[PDB]
Design a protein around this ligand. Structure first.
Ligand SMILES: Nc1ncnc2c1ncn2[C@@H]1O[C@H](COP(=O)(O)OP(=O)(O)O)[C@@H](O)[C@H]1O
Ligand SMILES: Nc1ncnc2c1ncn2[C@@H]1O[C@H](COP(=O)(O)OP(=O)(O)O)[C@@H](O)[C@H]1O
Ligand SMILES: Nc1ncnc2c1ncn2[C@@H]1O[C@H](COP(=O)(O)OP(=O)(O)O)[C@@H](O)[C@H]1O
Ligand SMILES: [Mg+2]
Ligand SMILES: [Mg+2]
Ligand SMILES: [Mg+2]
Ligand SMILES: [Zn+2]
Lengths: 637, 683, 637
């Protein structure tokens, strides 16, 4: 039976949708997208879901906003009905072959409802809450029968029955346990018609307080979240997540005479995978047309490589070719997948062996902070079980499996066991992890670029000795590292005063919105995995330095929209340089193998990607070989 | 009526059944109709499985359209709802079932004679109703229609000996055949005929799953049949036939296993391929329910396209986590396509023959096949020749005393870094239908053994094999051979000599069969070859592990000007264009190489006196040469009777590659040449 | 949940309604009527009900017809929904201030479903049956709450609840005993808002087998009929009725463990009051424009009175002025209701005293058969309790109360007790029955015209004696009779042969569709209380004679659309004739009182009504006085 208050709220939300035109634009775009590939194929179908900004709702109608936040069961169904009515009103051109219920998702500032699994108590029940946590368990995506269609052969007629549970609606119904129809009303045997029955995907994930904010030494708190038909498979275990949903109570909690307390869970409305450092979530960024224009504008510059090289770690003094190599690894080459099935690696590995305090770990931490997807590990702090996969009858991804299509920053690389070393041997060239353990023969993808830091045998790189004795690493392992940089802390007066002036200038830095003696606050930077190009603060005083967010945008653009093709004019340089490096006797820091030809190719491709060029020209090969010759010998030609 | 409302669907099953019957009777484009030929074969009991091609149905519909007749889309209806059309096609076949031209004899199956008996019994009961009503004297159409109302006959599913399967319509000959990942199979695809591409990870034993359990009643003499649909069933206690139900003294009825309907049941587990899993995800598995004659067509490690009806099952998880009518899902397998056809299932059909002659007539089969193994790897021709010989393998000899000779070639590639030993291992794994790539000191400690567990489907303790067991009658490519545990090394020793793994541990005492060819890749002592040091010194293989390998290559990376120039041109061409540089030489497609090697493995060449005399002389000269250099800085470990059998195995493999039955002098020449050049890279 | 079969039947009945345009015409007429007096008054509102001819449905779709007749619960709801959809489709102009459910009523040939309460067995259950019987009990028209509207003062909000019973739908629901809401969901006290709640009239009548067709000496059979919101008050006790409805079974019949058998009754869809002779149901007749044209055409004739006089009882020979008086009584005068409250009678009473076999009873039986509403009684066969009202704490109408606005044919008037005579005295002039018995002081209306037949004292009217001694009736009683006719069986040869030739010609009569020796069949003429003018069979062989149905149509038209006004030119004749009759000494058959002035006035008005004249002219008064002088003396002037 119709409710006057329900209709009043429906028309109020219709007024809200009319006021903010972005929601008709979103619904219209979704409908035209669905119709266009429906007619095209007689890709994927976008869900009937709209992101609603709670700030705009508060601006429009504060009580509707407070009603949704505090009494969602009475305000969300009317708003969803209004959205569905609006969508069916604009649906003048129906999809080929009210109706099509549209769901709502919420975003914005939740205030006191933005909680965690620890702070989510029983006085938040029946409220729209945003819970931030870590996904620890993801159940199987199971179909749920919401409508069963049967066939009666004697009458030749198709019947159906709709099913309802306590979690499909925000309000409580009268429970109607309608049985599965095994026969008609008048005795005819029914045959279930699979493919005409309706099954809805259902998942139940567990969100636990994030380790970065959970109290140390205390047992963590968890909360159940239920996802239905479009939020399933939106996250994976170990993901940082922000789930917006209604904190519901279900069952009777032992009152109904046939539990210790009422069964509580979150009916998920929105799932946002969050980006935290050293996690398995990549960093999607929004690239406006202005950002792309600036990226192309800077790519037109000749010295853009240098501009990108110095802007990586201005705080670190020097380490300029190391920064060039780090930028090239951030871009990386393009992997080759030949038709027969073979794989050519397109990821660049870097090793930095050096004396104490030459900033190898700060250069690792910077890469961890700025990379799209980076996992930080330490030698012997993570084993092969912790680096590669692990069998739990089920597999748990390790450091280098979560970092697939990403970067692995390994500090204290020398303090790594040989059992880990063999797994690392497999991961670096073939980019795969073969388990073959306890009846689980699986080949996980570990297409990751490894950057590592190491110390010499005696703790100080002796220039009198040779590198092979100063490294104490297997030669086969050192071959996998595309670029091996030996950094030595030479005491020279010019660079001594220059590095000290830099260190002090960096220490004498103030944020734009801070006082002289105000302790700088620090948050954990839980970015959402979806305004000037250059940097005001320049530790060096000189070319221009771009901001780290803009550098990340540039790296993302070049990494996702540029796939350079090798050219003969680059091949001549690459082949000549490889032949010289193989045959010339120079007492190289690292050996020269066919892997050296491919690090030449990969670095040339990466530098071509830096310039946004779709073809690797001669200059790219020359600069790649230049960096390689520096890395092998120390030349400055 | 108000409850259980009726819905109007665009599916009319009466004319769909009529179209099914017309297609079965009239389709002949693949001397007469293809399907009645198949039903005639089934009637005479040469065939127990009916595979309905969706390509045939699509072609029939296209022909009907071309002649102007409007035909309902049977293919789309089958794809959308496949469970009903198995039921439909079975009824249609039963209607058009030809009479058998062969009488029942004593060499027929017990099921066949049971079905014949019940068919004759039901026809006799029809005739008996008819005669009784005629004697009662109360048109033959009405008489018949009364008879089938007063008869309790055996239903057609009890007089049914064949199994029905739906082969998906080919992509080139085109929804049910486009391969889907395990993730891509959502609940929208439930109830449809879909194809999933994956790798099989666990197959259960073929068990008898009851479908229609039969009982006999000693009171009324009836046979009461109860259909079984779920995991568990409750047996009947009192008879439910007409006589006992009408009477007051009911009869207690006993099970009849021979009269019950059983199905060969397997529950396989398919898994996502590495190319299908998204970034940072763990592959998820899917349950495949294999029934009927389709069993034993899936084995662990198989990369297959499995086409079946995606069907729901009752929930089996925790009851407290059930929110609604949650259902488990499985794939009722209907068709299996093997990406890598097994060497055992090779048949010399016409198309296989034409391809083999087009390979042979091109000439230079040995070198073409060797150079086609990883064609982007450059300049390892003796290496690729030895790998091809390993793929073909020698001729297994069982002496009458019960002795067995291995017949399989183990090849060890010890070399410097960056020489493509690991790339050659994955090439062999790709070529081999049963190839297992493992890395030493990874997680293969249990891999080079089998682990005893419980089968979840069937309440048994079964030991699931690992790397050396899953690669049985195949190839195990072991990378980083010099970095395994002692137990793994001993297991490799046993596998390479006796082709078995003897396990005597707490809970198990078995001798596993591992007929595996071992292709090992190793790094020399210190990771780089020191030519100053002795070859045996730089080889970290016990004289007994080294002895087992039929060939041991020493792939050394010496710098040069022309050789390095040529490798770099090849690698850089491969990087520009995803293909090898040479235009004169065209590599053999890996599927056509597997077919040639499968054909070659069917030959068992023998050695004559004139060839084995030279084999003896060469063995003597090799032994003398090995004796003359025991520590001369070029010692490879002295020759052994194992080198003679390796020479013999290589000669037999080379003879097989020629598709010959005589082991000729050319093959022994090439075997000696390969053994000699296995070690010339040192010089 | 929608049903495919329900929609198929809805669209089939929509096709049926489109094919037969009369149903859109009826629905459109009903809607425009409702809108027109809705806007007029910001009379009565026609119900949303349509008469459906089952013959037309059988012509259109025989299975839909058989489905309605045999399975009404599955075919009547879809047809009603189709009618409602059609009505709301034509409702382009809504009434001032789907919706408005339209009900269906059925008419036509029912075949085996046309039954009686005796022949209505349990194998007619759940079938659409037409039952003919007599109404014996009519329960109170009680309101039934179908929607209760409540007000919550704390929230100031209006709530409602709909109620459903087993008799409101043809199909069986799940019973939902929703309680009367005495409070809101959250504890607020509710106040019932009468006048906003919805009450539907409900009546339960009992239909018993009609006495004319029930077996003699056997206990009659009865059936319950339930009428809802427009069929209530359509009948009264004693009415012959034809009820079309679904023979429903209700309850559990003792199976539900908490009756001897299942409770069965008829859910009335249609109520037709039937016209049977000597019953309380008048005879509505359909007057087409052709009938009215013929009536006016004949009224233009001068001798129409004679044409109507001879056509009354052609079978009776003679009795011509008696027939004129009978026709005038059938028309009658116009009653006067003065402002102070007094009443002047406009009904004409006739008494016929005569010898045996002068057709007094045949002239009574003819009046019973042809009158619009006539009740036949016999002296001492009905007492004052049987003639006037009777107290049962409730009143039961007698012969002269049921015959209100009708005719009472009393045979054997002389054999009537004086206790009845006093009540008849009251009924004839004041036209009322005052009970004043057992605490029931009631004045029932008995505005009836009395025609009576009587025999003399000695059985033969002695012409030697005077009328006052030959009648033996009270003089005050004879004054009430407007026209007293003394008929004597004089043996005269001319009229002897003429009456005998007439009697034989009447006996030698054959119906148009009968053989020479075929026994004429005879039905009970159960006319429905809603083609030539003249008669082919003429016993006299002469003016033309009109058919009895056409004469009934003419009497109905003149009686319902003509109200003559007296004129001075008629008053002069009336006054002169009355003065002469009062003063002239002629030994009148009946006394002359002021009632004689008013029988002159009434007869003049009746004759004016015969000519369809709205004014009583001089000729009407002259002919009235002529008939009166004949009736008093026997003159032929
Ligand atoms: N070349 C350099 N330029 C700037 N800061 C430096 C440099 N070398 C060392 N530092 C500083 O030294 C500190 C320690 O460096 P760290 O990265 O921990 O050294 P290591 O690589 O030996 O672990 C940091 O605060 C870092 O900024
Ligand atoms: N002869 C060769 N031809 C082509 N590529 C080669 C050759 N030798 C080495 N490579 C390249 O060297 C890279 C590393 O070789 P890999 O097989 O991993 O080394 P190893 O076998 O020594 O462990 C591969 O990407 C491969 O393409
Ligand atoms: N004048 C008459 N004309 C025609 N039929 C007459 C006449 N008088 C008597 N009858 C016949 O006499 C029969 C008996 O008449 P009835 O009405 O019973 O007489 P009464 O008035 O004495 O009771 C009827 O069949 C009637 O037709
Ligand atoms: Mg450090
Ligand atoms: Mg390797
Ligand atoms: Mg009489
Ligand atoms: Zn029995």
């Amino acid at each position: 039976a119709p409710d006057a208050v329900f209709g009043d709220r429906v028309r109020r939300f219709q007024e809200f949708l009319d006021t903010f035109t972005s929601y008709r634009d979103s619904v219209r775009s979704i409908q035209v997208y669905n119709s266009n590939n429906a007619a095209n194929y007689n890709l994927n179908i976008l869900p009937h879901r709209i992101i609603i900004s709670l700030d705009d709702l508060r601006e429009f109608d504060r009580s509707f906003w407070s009603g949704i936040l505090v009494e969602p069961a009475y305000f969300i169904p009317p708003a969803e009905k209004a959205l569905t009515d609006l969508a069916d009103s604009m649906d003048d051109v129906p999809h080929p072959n009210s109706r099509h219920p549209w769901k709502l998702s919420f975003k914005g500032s939740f205030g006191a409802h933005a909680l965690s699994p620890r702070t989510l108590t029983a006085q938040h029940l029946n409220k729209l809450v945003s819970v931030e946590g870590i996904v620890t368990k993801t159940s199987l995506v199971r179909p749920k029968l919401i409508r069963s269609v049967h066939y009666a052969a004697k009458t030749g007629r198709f019947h159906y029955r709709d099913y309802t549970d306590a979690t499909t609606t925000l309000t409580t119904r009268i429970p109607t346990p309608a049985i599965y129809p095994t026969e008609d009303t008048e005795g005819n045997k029914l045959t279930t018609e699979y493919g005409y029955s309706t099954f809805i995907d259902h998942q139940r994930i567990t969100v636990q307080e994030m380790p970065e904010m959970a109290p140390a030494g205390q047992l963590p708190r968890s909360i159940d979240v239920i996802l239905d038909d479009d939020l399933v498979d939106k996250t994976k275990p170990g993901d940082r997540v922000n789930v917006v949903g209604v904190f519901k109570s279900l069952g009777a909690g032992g009152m109904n005479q046939s539990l210790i307390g009422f069964k509580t869970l979150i009916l998920g409305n929105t799932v946002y995978p969050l980006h935290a450092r050293s996690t398995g979530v990549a960093a999607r960024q929004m690239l406006t047309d202005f950002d792309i224009r600036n990226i192309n504008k800077l790519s037109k510059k000749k010295d853009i490589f240098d501009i990108l090289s110095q802007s990586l770690a201005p705080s670190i003094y020097g380490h300029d070719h190391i920064k060039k190599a780090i930028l090239l690894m951030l871009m990386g080459g393009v992997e080759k997948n030949l038709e027969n099935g073979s794989h050519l690696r397109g990821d660049i590995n870097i090793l930095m062996v050096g004396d104490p305090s030459t900033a190898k770990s700060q250069l690792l931490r910077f890469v961890l902070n700025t990379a799209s997807l980076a996992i930080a590990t330490t030698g012997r702090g993570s084993s092969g079980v912790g680096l590669t996969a692990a069998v739990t009858r089920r597999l748990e991804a390790g450091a280098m499996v979560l970092a697939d299509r990403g970067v692995v920053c390994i500090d204290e690389f020398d303090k790594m066991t040989d059992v880990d070393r063999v797994a690392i041997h497999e991961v670096m060239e073939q980019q795969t992890v073969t388990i073959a353990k306890a009846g689980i023969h699986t080949t996980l993808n570990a297409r990751c670029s490894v950057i590592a830091a190491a110390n010499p045998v005696f703790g100080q790189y002796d220039v009198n000795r040779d590198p092979h004795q100063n490294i104490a690493l297997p030669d086969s392992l050192l071959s996998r590292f595309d670029l091996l940089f030996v950094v030595t802390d030479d005491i020279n007066e010019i660079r001594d005063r220059s590095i000290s002036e830099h260190v002090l200038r960096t220490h004498r830095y103030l944020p734009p919105g801070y006082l002289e003696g105000e302790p700088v606050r620090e948050r954990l930077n839980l970015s959402l995995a979806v305004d000037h190009v250059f940097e005001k603060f320049n530790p060096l005083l000189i070319p221009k330095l771009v901001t780290i967010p803009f550098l990340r945008k540039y790296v993302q653009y070049a990494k996702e929209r540029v796939i350079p093709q090798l050219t003969q004019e680059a091949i001549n340089v690459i082949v000549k340089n490889y032949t010289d490096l193989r045959n010339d006797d120079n007492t190289k820091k690292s050996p020269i193998t066919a892997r050296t030809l491919e690090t030449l190719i990969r670095l040339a491709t990466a530098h071509a990607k830096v310039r946004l060029s779709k073809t690797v020209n001669k200059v790219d090969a020359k600069v790649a070989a230049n960096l390689l010759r520096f890395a092998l010998l120390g030349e400055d030609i | 009526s108000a409850a259980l409302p009726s819905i109007q669907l665009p599916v009319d099953y009466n004319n769909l059944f009529n179209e099914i019957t017309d297609f079965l009777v009239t389709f002949k484009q693949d001397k007469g109709p293809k399907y009645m030929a198949m039903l005639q074969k089934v009637a005479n009991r040469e065939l127990n499985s009916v595979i309905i091609d969706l390509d045939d149905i699509l072609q029939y519909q296209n022909e009907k359209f071309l002649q102007g007749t409007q035909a309902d889309d049977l293919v789309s209806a089958i794809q959308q709802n496949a469970n009903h059309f198995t039921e439909l096609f079975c009824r249609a076949i039963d209607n058009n079932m030809p009479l058998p031209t062969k009488e029942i004899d004593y060499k027929d199956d017990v099921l066949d004679v049971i079905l014949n008996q019940r068919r004759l019994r039901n026809e006799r009961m029809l005739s008996d109703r008819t005669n009784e009503i005629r004697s009662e004297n109360l048109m033959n159409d009405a008489l018949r229609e009364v008879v089938e109302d007063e008869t309790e006959l055996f239903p057609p599913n009890l007089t049914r000996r064949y199994f029905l399967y739906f082969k998906p319509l080919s992509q080139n000959c085109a929804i049910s055949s486009k391969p889907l990942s395990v993730r891509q199979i959502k609940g929208d695809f439930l109830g449809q005929l879909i194809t999933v591409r994956g790798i099989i990870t666990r197959v259960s034993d073929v068990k008898p799953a009851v479908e229609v359990i039969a009982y006999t009643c000693d009171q009324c003499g009836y046979e009461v049949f109860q259909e079984v649909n779920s995991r568990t069933f409750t047996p009947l206690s009192e008879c439910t036939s007409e006589e006992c139900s009408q009477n007051q003294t009911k009869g207690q009825l006993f099970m009849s296993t021979r009269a019950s309907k059983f199905s060969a049941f397997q529950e396989c587990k398919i898994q996502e391929l590495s190319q299908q899993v998204p970034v940072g995800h763990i592959p998820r598995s899917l349950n495949i329910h294999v029934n009927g004659t389709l069993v034993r067509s899936l084995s662990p490690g198989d990369i297959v396209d499995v086409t079946g009806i995606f069907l729901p099952a009752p929930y089996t998880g925790f009851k407290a986590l059930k929110a609604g009518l949650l259902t488990e899902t499985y794939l009722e397998a209907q068709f299996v396509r093997q990406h890598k056809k097994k060497f055992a299932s090779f048949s010399l059909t016409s198309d296989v023959e034409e391809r083999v002659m087009e390979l042979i007539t091109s000439g230079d089969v040995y070198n073409r096949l060797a150079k086609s193994i990883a064609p982007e790897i450059y300049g390892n021709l003796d290496v690729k020749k030895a790998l091809l010989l390993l793929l073909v393998g020698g001729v297994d000899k069982r002496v009458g005393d019960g002795m067995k000779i291995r017949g399989d070639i183990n090849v060890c590639l010890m070399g410097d870094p960056g020489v493509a030993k690991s790339q050659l291992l994955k090439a062999i794994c790709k070529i081999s239908p049963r190839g297992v790539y493992t890395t030493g000191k990874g997680s293969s400690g249990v891999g080079l053994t089998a682990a005893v567990m419980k089968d979840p489907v069937t309440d048994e303790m079964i030991l699931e094999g690992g790397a050396l067991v899953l690669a049985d009658n195949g190839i195990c490519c072991i990378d980083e051979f010099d970095k395994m545990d002692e137990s793994d090394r001993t297991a490799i020793h046993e596998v390479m000599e006796q082709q078995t793994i003897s396990i005597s541990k707490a809970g198990i005492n078995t001798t596993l069969n591992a007929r595996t060819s071992i292709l090992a890749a190793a790094n020399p002592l210190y990771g780089r070859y020191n030519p100053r040091l002795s070859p045996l010194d730089n080889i970290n293989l016990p004289a007994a592990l080294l002895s087992r390998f039929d060939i041991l290559f020493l792939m050394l990376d010496i710098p040069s000007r022309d050789d390095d120039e040529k490798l770099a041109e090849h690698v850089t061409y491969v990087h520009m264009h995803n293909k090898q540089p040479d235009l004169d030489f065209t590599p053999v497609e890996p599927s056509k190489m597997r077919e040639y090697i499968a054909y070659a493995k069917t030959k068992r060449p023998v050695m004559s006196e004139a060839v084995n005399d030279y084999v003896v002389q060469a063995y003597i000269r090799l032994r003398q040469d090995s004796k003359r250099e025991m520590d001369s800085k070029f010692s490879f470990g002295q020759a052994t009777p194992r080198t003679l059998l390796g020479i013999i195995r290589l000669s037999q493999a080379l003879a097989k590659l020629r598709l010959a039955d005589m082991v000729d002098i050319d093959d022994v020449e090439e075997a000696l040449r390969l053994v000699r050049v296995s070690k010339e890279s040192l010089y």
